């Protein structure tokens, strides 16, 4: 009945990517108390580093993929292989997830994918921090916050949109995303609203859906998951936020 919480990197990212996040929650916010790190090989390898006790409270799960720059159906495929060896070990019947960009994609994709699964943990809250949900390309996506639909949709959005149906109706959403100016929609390397566009397939899917939007030069996309606000907003929505209704709340902005 524990609920873990796996932290998920972004591509080019590793175990250690979200340790700033993790040392927050076990250190300073101490709402966790226990820490494994797990990492899978597509080669065939999976890795447990550390042993979590009947004492765990809110384990972390510090998630590596060693091909860190793979696809994010590849890396949920792969995900769950490692989760279906972790419920094994431990018997955890949810999760929680935390993914920086490509890293919040395989949780999509394991959310939409799996959620009916017994062999692995259901997937409850997901936290996605800058994940190009639209992909990159600012002509796909524009620059309207107020968007009803997209541009164009990619064939990852339109797998998104086509399984949306299967996501668990308690699965709780928060998408981060980063603007690096008010007239500059992008993260750096995202645009702003690939990275909301959760808000086509998720709401009514899902039991909650919340947006955030920063702003500025430090919204940068290869640090958004190191943000004071981000750390924050992600604290919140692990172990503040609770609802039995329906939530949506989306950002305008």
Known sequence: DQIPIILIHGSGGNASSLDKMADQLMNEYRSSNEALTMTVNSEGKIKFEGKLTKDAKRPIIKFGFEQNQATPDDWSKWLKIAMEDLKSRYGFTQMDGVGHS????????????????????????????????????????????????????????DYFIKNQTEVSPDLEVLAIAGELS??????????????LATRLFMPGSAKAYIEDIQVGEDAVHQTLHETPKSIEKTYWFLEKFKTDETVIQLDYK
């Open 182 to 195: 008010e007239d500059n929609p992008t993260d750096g390397i995202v645009p702003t609203i690939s990275s």
């Open 102 to 157: 490509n890293g919040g994609l395989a949780l999509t994709y394991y959310a939409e994918d799996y959620a009916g699964d017994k062999t692995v943990p259901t997937l409850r809250k997901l936290v996605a921090i800058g994940s190009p949900f639209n992909d990159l390309d600012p002509n796909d996506n524009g620059m309207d916050l107020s968007f009803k639909k997209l541009p164009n949709s990619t064939p990852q959005m």
